[PDB]
Amino acid sequence: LSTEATAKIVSEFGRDANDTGSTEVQVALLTAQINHLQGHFAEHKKDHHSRRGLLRMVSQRRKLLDYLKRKDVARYTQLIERLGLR
Amino acid sequence: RRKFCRFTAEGVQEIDYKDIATLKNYITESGKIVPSRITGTRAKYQRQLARAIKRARYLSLLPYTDRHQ
Amino acid sequence: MRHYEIVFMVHPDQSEQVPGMIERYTAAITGAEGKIHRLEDWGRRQLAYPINKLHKAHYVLMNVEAPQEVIDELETTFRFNDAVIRSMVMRTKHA
Amino acid sequence: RKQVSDGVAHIHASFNNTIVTITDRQGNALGWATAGGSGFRGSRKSTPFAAQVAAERCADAVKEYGIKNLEVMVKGPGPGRESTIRALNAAGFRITNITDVTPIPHNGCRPPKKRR
RNA sequence: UGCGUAGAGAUCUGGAGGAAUACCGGUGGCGAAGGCGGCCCCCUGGACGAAGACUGACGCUCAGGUGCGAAAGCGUGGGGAGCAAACAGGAUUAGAUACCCUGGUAGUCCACGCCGUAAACGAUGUCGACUUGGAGGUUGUGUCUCGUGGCUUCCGGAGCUAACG
C-alpha cells in the first residue's frame, strides 16, 4: 500500500481534519489491507502463514465494528454502507 | 607489559580489514582479541580495531578461535 | 529507479575480444534503460576459488541507475554470454 | 628416463599409513611408495618407521629418473608424517621447501561414522 | 569368507546422477512449538528506538467452540547414490533367532492425503506494581573514559526452597 494510497483513504474517512485514528478511519485501513490480502489468497493458496495475518486483521475489524455499532448505531450503518463489509 | 602491539608496528589504518599481516598481531594465541594492555591502542582505536577484526574474520582471513600450544 | 552495482567476471584468457563483450555489455546495460555513473576495471586478478576451472578472472565495476523492475531481466541477458562466468547485481554500499 | 631433475614430493600422512608420491612440476607422478609397498601388512604400516622406508624408496626410485631437488607437500596428520619428511631431507634429494597443504575442510561434508 | 595377471585396488582426465551442505559455528542466533543454518530476487509476519504528533481505556482471563500442532507408520504416484528394520551368510559363544564382518527389502528422498502424541521439561501460564548491586554482550539515544531505554547471559543483597537452586 503506497503512502498516498494510505493517506488518501484516511482523509476520505476522516471524521474531521487531522483525524488519524477513529473507528471509521481504522476500520477503513483494515478493510483496505484485508482486500489486498484476500486478493493475495486467490493466488498463493500455499501461503498459510499469511492466512493467520488476515485472521488477526479481520478479528480486529470485527471488534472495532462491534464497538461502534454498540455505541453509535448510526455511524455504523453509514460506515458499512460506504466500505461494503458484511 | 612486555611490548605493546602498537609500538612494535608502523602507522597503519585500523579501518583496513584486509591487511591480515598487521591484524594478526592483535590476535593472541587464540582468535581472541588482545586487551588494551597488550594492544597498546586506546578506546577510540580499540573499538575500531575490534570491528575491523570482526569483518576480517568473516572474510575468513582471521581465525575466530585457535588451539592452544 | 535507484542505484545498482553490476559486477561482471569473464574469462581472462580472452584476447582483443575483451573489448567487445563489454561492447555487448554496454549494449546490454542500454535498452535495459540503465545509466552508468562511474566505471572501475580491476582487470585480471587471483580468484579465491577456481570457477570455470580457470584460476583467474577479469573483474569490472559499473554502478548503474535503472528501474528496479528490469534489474532482473538485466541479469538474464548478461549470463548468456559464454565468456562471462558470473554477474551479481548488488543494491548499493558494500562493506 | 625423462630426467625430471626437479619436482614435488607429496606426503599423504595418515593414521592408517603414510604414502609418498614424487612428481614433476606438472603433477604427473613419476613414482610412488608406501609401507604396504615395503612389505608391511596393514597394522605395522602406520608406524613412522614404515614411513621412512617408503620415503627413501620412493625417493631412490626417483633418483633413477634423475631428479635431484623436490618440493615436499604434507597432507593430513598421522604417525610417520614428520618421519617421512626428514627421510626425504636425507636420501639423495635436496628438500627445497616444505608446505602443509593439508585440506582440513570448511562446511558441507558429513563426517564418517568414526568422526560422528 | 570374498575380490585379483579375459586386470579390480591404487593414480590422472572427462562425463552423469542423487543427496548432503566440509572453516566460519560458538560455550552464538531466530521461531509459538517442532524445528531452522551458501548466495540472489520476489512476497510476507513479528519486534525495537527516537519525535511525542493522533484516538482514548475500547481492559484481563477465558467452560464450550474453532484453528495450529515433532516423530512414527499408513494411502496413491514417482524416485532410489548412499544407509539400513525384516532378512541372506560368515564369525564369536556353552547357546547368540546380539554385539563384530559380507549382502540386503520396506523405509530413508520428492508430490499429495492421514494422525495429535511426547522427559510437547526451565518436568515452575499471562499482565501490572514493588525489592542491593557487579560483570559480558546485542540494539537506540544522550552533555559517549559515562548516563539512560528495550533484549540476551553469568555472579550475586534481602528474601524464597526439603535439598538442588
Q: Do the beta carbons of residue C60 and residue C40 sit within 8 Å?
A: yes
Q: Return the ∠ at Cα A81 (arms to A76 and A84), rounded to 5°.
A: 110
- Antiparallel, parallel or unpaired: β C56-66 and C40-46: antiparallel
Question: What resolution (Å)?
Answer: 15.0
D108 Cβ within 7 A of any nucleic strand E atom? yes
Q: Which residue has the cell 634429494?
A: D93
C22: which 3 cell numbers? 563489454
Q: Do the beta carbons of residue A66 and residue A23 sit within 8 Å?
A: no
For the CA of A26 and the C1' of E6, the distance in angstroms is 87
Query: CA–CA separation, B59 vs A39, rounded Å?
Result: 44
Length of chain B equals 69
Query: CA–CA separation, D90 vs D73, rounded Å?
Result: 16
Structural determination approach: cryo-EM
Query: CA–CA separation, D84 vs D17, rounded Å?
Result: 11
How many H-runs (helices) and E-runs (strands) does chain C carry? 2, 5
For the CA of D29 and the C1' of E13, the distance in angstroms is 14
D109 Cβ within 7 A of any nucleic strand E atom? yes
Other beta carbons less than 10 A from residue C9's beta carbon: 21
Rounded to 10°, the helix C71-80/C18-29 angle is 160
Please provide residue A73's backbone torsions phi and psi, each rounded to the nearest 5 degrees. Answer: -70, -25
DSSP string, A24-41: HHHHHHHHHHHHHHHHHH
Among D110, D31, D43, CA closest to D67: D31
Residue D112 exposed, middle or buried by CB count within 10 Å (0-12, 13-18, 19+): exposed
Neighbour-count burial for D100-111, b at 16+ CB within 10 Å, e otherwise: eeeeeeeeeeee
Query: CA–CA separation, D4 vs D69, rounded Å?
Result: 9
SS3 assignment, position C80: helix
Query: CA–CA separation, A14 vs A25, rounded Å?
Result: 6
CA B4 from chain centre, in angstroms, equals 12
Query: CA–CA separation, C64 vs C41, rounded Å?
Result: 14
Other beta carbons less than 10 A from residue D32's beta carbon: 18
B48: which 3 cell numbers? 575500531
D112: which 3 cell numbers? 564418517
Residue D17 exposed, middle or buried by CB count within 10 Å (0-12, 13-18, 19+): buried
Other beta carbons less than 10 A from residue A78's beta carbon: 13
D29 Cβ within 7 A of any nucleic strand E atom? yes
Report in angstroms the alpha-carbon separations of B15 from A18, B12, B23, B51.
49, 9, 10, 9
Query: CA–CA separation, B39 vs D27, rounded Å?
Result: 44
A18 Cβ within 7 A of any nucleic strand E atom? yes
Longest dimension (CA), chain A: 42
Neighbours of chain D (3+ CB pairs under 8 A): none
Q: Which residue has the cell 582468535?
A: B31
Q: Do the beta carbons of residue C24 and residue C79 sit within 8 Å?
A: no
Q: Return the ∠ at Cα D18 (arms to D86 and D16), rounded to 5°.
A: 140
Query: CA–CA separation, C26 vs C35, rounded Å?
Result: 10
For the CA of A49 and the C1' of E120, the distance in angstroms is 21
Query: CA–CA separation, D61 vs D66, rounded Å?
Result: 9
Report in angstroms the alpha-carbon separations of D82 from B69, D20, D102.
18, 12, 13
Query: CA–CA separation, D43 vs D73, rounded Å?
Result: 25
SS3 assignment, position C43: strand
B69 Cβ within 7 A of any nucleic strand E atom? no
For the CA of A51 and the C1' of E95, the distance in angstroms is 64
SS3 assignment, position C5: strand
- β-strand partners of C80: none
Q: Do the beta carbons of residue A25 and residue A16 sit within 8 Å?
A: no
B60 Cβ within 7 A of any nucleic strand E atom? yes
